[PDB]
Amino acid sequence: HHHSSGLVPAAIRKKLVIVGDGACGKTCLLIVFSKDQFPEVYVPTVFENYIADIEVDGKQVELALWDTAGQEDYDRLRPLSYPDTDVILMCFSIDSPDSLENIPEKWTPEVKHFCPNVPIILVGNKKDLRQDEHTRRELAKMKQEPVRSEEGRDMANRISAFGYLECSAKTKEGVREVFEMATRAGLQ
Ligand SMILES: Nc1nc2c(ncn2[C@@H]2O[C@H](COP(=O)(O)OP(=O)(O)NP(=O)(O)O)[C@@H](O)[C@H]2O)c(=O)[nH]1
């Protein structure tokens, strides 16, 4: 199922799990949040084990960041990461409308199966690529275009996400806000 354009008109301890299609930017997102530095050379498939400290709404939170591999090859073992999750970051890439279509097709059924009633933040990654010339040209040859914010929002509504946010690990735009939202969701 490929995306069709234009159809949308004391410290508290919490476990966060990030999921989404391969290469949609999960690990870079965790790294930029944790280390404040975009990895421009080497990126591990999954980020090192990591507990981040974050203050949100006057509450001090420790966020364990559980990275997962997006590729189908890892489907059998990925559910090992789901028990006792407090919040899910469910990602797609704005430069890949097909990764958005995998939200309802793959990720939402998987997460809702293993993490029933755990809040989901839908996250559009790689926001910097929305108007990027190479991205537009590459997607145009497939009759597609970068994900529009309204398409992300519609999808977040469709899957009953706690919220929808866009970010760019590369530019840092909106990264802090993603994790602040996840923290708010994990707290309530
Ligand atoms: N332009 C741009 N590229 C990004 C951004 N975040 C990550 N990337 C790029 O996207 C590619 C994949 O990033 P990565 O974080 O490894 O993706 P992943 O979702 O962790 N992949 P996997 O599921 O296989 O572990 C890398 O080449 C990285 O440089 C971003 O915000 N903007």
Ligand SMILES: [Mg+2]
């Ligand atoms: Mg990764």
